[PDB]
Amino acid sequence: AQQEWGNEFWKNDPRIAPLRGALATFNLTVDDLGVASFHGTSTKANDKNESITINKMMQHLGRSEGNPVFGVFQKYLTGHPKGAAGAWMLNGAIQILQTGIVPGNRNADNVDKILEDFEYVLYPSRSIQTDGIKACSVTSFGFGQKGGQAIVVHPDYLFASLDSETFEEYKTKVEARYKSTYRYMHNAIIRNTMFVAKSDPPYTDELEQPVYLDPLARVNNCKKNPSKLVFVNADVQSKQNFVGKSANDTAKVISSL
Amino acid sequence: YQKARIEPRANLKFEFPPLKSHKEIQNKAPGLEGLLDLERVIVVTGFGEVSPWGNTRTRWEMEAFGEFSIEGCLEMAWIMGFIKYHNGNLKGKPYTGWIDAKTNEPVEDKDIKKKYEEEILAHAGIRLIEPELFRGYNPEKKELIQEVIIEQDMAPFVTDESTAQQYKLQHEDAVDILKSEESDEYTVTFKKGARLFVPKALRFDRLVAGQIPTGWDAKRYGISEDTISQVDPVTLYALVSTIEALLSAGITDPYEFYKYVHVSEVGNCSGSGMGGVSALRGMFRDRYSDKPVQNDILQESFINTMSAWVNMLLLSSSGPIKTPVGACATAVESVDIGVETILSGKAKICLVGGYDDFQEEGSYEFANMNATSNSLDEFDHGRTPQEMSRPATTTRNGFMEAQGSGTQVIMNAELAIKMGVPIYAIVALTATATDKIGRSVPAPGKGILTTAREHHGSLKTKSPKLDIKYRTRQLNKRKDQI
Amino acid sequence: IGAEVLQGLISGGAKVIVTTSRFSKKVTEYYQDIYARFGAAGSCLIVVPFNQGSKQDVEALIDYIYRDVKDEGLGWDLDAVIPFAAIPEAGIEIDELGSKSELAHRIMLTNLLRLLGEVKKQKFTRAINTRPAQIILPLSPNHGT
Amino acid sequence: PVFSHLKARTYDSYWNWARQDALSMYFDIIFGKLTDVDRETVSQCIQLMNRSNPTLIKFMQYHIDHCPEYKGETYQLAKSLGQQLIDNCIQVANQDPVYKDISYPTGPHTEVDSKGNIVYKEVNRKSVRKLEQYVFEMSQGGELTKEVAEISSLSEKTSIVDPVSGGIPPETVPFLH
């Protein structure tokens, strides 16, 4: 029910766009897509063609006039890595959300004359500190008709959907995890041991096949080395795995008759 | 009158997202409470990269601020091998800080941006092609071989027994081999009409590329030499943005995944565009030219074996693997595969991203397609290498090739709240779309325009499920039937 | 002075061509920041590398301004020439008339008068006698004082 | 001869930097870097009226119609200061652009401390507050020279109530002539 009515109500609806309904699931509008991280390879044919689509997407969806997307073009200082590009643009669009800074194309010294008919796109040349970006849009184009587009929403629209008991239990777990990876990353910088390649899988050889056939087999800590965490025989096809708390410790009213 | 001063050493903190309060969040986004199924919400949990501008922390403060801070210049000088750490004793006095690498001087953290700021900005980004980073590839002397038929017989020379039988096997009447009556060597004379290959060199136009900073070594991240000498150079870029995407999530041990998730539920949908092109050169040219290439150079050329070395060295998962190819958009395609593996239920954590490499042969072929900027034509316009990539500018001419990788870690929202990992983003949708009929492969089109498609022909009302009041009313009466 | 006359001309709505001897990335980003902040509707700023000590340079520049756009020029017609180019020479008496002193005199007097001779020739061969170019000379009060 | 017509950098795109400067002014007011009592705020509204087209008036209207004025006084300030700039840029449509030096006419000052150090700074002139008072100060001359609501009004053309030519003292020279 939560995905018929809350989460993916819009999927094969001909009245709701995908790009509109992907924002409508967090009660956002089309006007809340702040930044559009362009592919933007400094190619004559690419940069004109990409601005046509993002303008025509916003024009068809009824984005209000005077609301352009801030087109950021990351490839002025990194270049085009021809396949790691959509991951750099997705890493960059995440940092626009959590900071609010919309960076500027510092190699844009004179934006093209044709690009002023696209009134739904703004091309900044220096970084502007927005009060907050709610959604970005990473689009990229490949050789061989390989257009793609990802939409990325600020994570505070997930934490709205939780309750105060789930969020506070989450918040103390992520701050206890931050102290564990602060200690690791400060050690691993000065000792050059970020990558610790494993030598063994978390099971032995005659635990390898019993683990694969049990969907409820989870790793616990070893006893002779608590820093190493492995599959033991008691985790595999265990007797406390399917049976739980709410229906079996409270099976004193259903097993009493 | 000489008061005690303070020297500001760098305070590197590897910060998580800044979680604001719950009352602030629900005032900003009211209405959503129990309406979203968290298992159908894909979140980005960690991310990392290797770039011409270092990693994902030093690239951002160059992209946003235009210069490095004292903690992003220490992080950059550590990457490029300028400073080392040394705890203990040197020159008698006990010292426990950072130490220069060329000399052994105790550099202070305040003096990083006055000592190495020249060398960091000169050896990162979109500088000229440095030949020591590409096994001696000098684009100003681009090597070919020319087939020549000799019109006069050649001076005889000595060789091995097996090699002389290989010259006779190729061209038979254009060689006469002859065994030495004393030793077990042969005399080879190439008579006229034989074909040779004389090397020549030409001046190639494309001299600028965006390289990984000079001094980047994957042993600094902990990768052993037995992995360095075996795998392709792209696999090292994929292995250190996977360990950086996992450490951006607080996953310091990848086997912590298996306290919440079965081993068949950790995927890997990273992909490349061309794969290990440094191994494709080793089997198509370097073995044709009899250079000593390793025997399993075919297995390092596959696009899917960079994500195999991730599972072979880090993850040990038996979960899905779906490696895509998009060749310029293969990390947005890889996100599309990664969110569909998790929404189907086949995986719960999915490594996702893209990786590629700059090499000589692909650089020459992009120039033949007229896709890359003519770097000598940009010198006629007075452009620096640092300003040869100008998107949306009226005088733009071709792209600028780079190398590196980028990796995200996507998972369920319900699993991410349970593990207590940081959530950086929400992947709202991902789409992929081809174009119309043409006869030109590297030509873009308006194909992704179908991600905003809507029918509003004569419809006079809104869609009734476009307001959250109605959808919370139908869901709450369905929650009562359950 | 000339960089402040430039941003007043540009914010007034004029088409300005600016010459530079030290053409670099720092210089062309200085002038782009002027247009990005102090531009106006219909204004245009053009930055060229230009050495006023050279005679072939002051002839190639004015020809580029008056050439047609199909002949890879600007198609313009000057309305003002503000020749503020100089060399800061100091400590030079009557007996140290060196190479820097003779070069600076070619910039400030000889090729200045040659630059106005080119502007007259381009207007005369196109028969432009109803559009004079106003020369603003940077005179001085102190002649050897 | 260091010249080429290939190295010529042309800048034309006022239409993009107008919207970029209108937005960066909008967040400097919100984050407390600009106030209406500043010389930098009024000097930025002057450039937004020179670079005025109907697409910027759409841009600056949207961000002040959808301005969350309840969030603070700087959100109330940006909606109030920005609304005056809407009406100013509407009236100066179909007009020529304007060079106005609205800055402060500073003057010199040199000072030696007791420790011994030449410091130089450009301080505000006492009598002369704006540039119209600079032209009056230039016409009066010196003694040995003698012989034997600001944002909303940037669109309205002022009338000269008295010319400075009447206020020149007789038979003496001004500072600029």
Added chain:
Amino acid sequence: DYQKPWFAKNEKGTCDLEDMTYKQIAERLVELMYVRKSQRWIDVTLRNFTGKFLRRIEERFATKVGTISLIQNFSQLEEPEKAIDSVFKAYPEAASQLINEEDCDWFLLEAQSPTQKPVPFIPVLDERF
């Protein structure tokens, strides 16, 4: 059972040295090498070791190029709360951020230093235990 207790301690019991914040270290030293009843330190070198740590707090969380140390001389550590609360007032995120491994190497190399009384605790189990 031993006179040199295990140094590292936070909430949820004992820990390693890298699990304590910069404030939890600086007030565990005063818990261990400052006597409350007789109002003295154990040694004058143990008072300067606490002051050299407090100067490492101010160095870590500092300004652009250099400012005034709040501990201008170690003689003001005879009232140790007044010097501690003045440092974590100027640098308030030192009360919540754990100690770097570089500063832990400083803490363990200063503890093994001559011309200093050996520390009245045990900071690490190692070959130097």
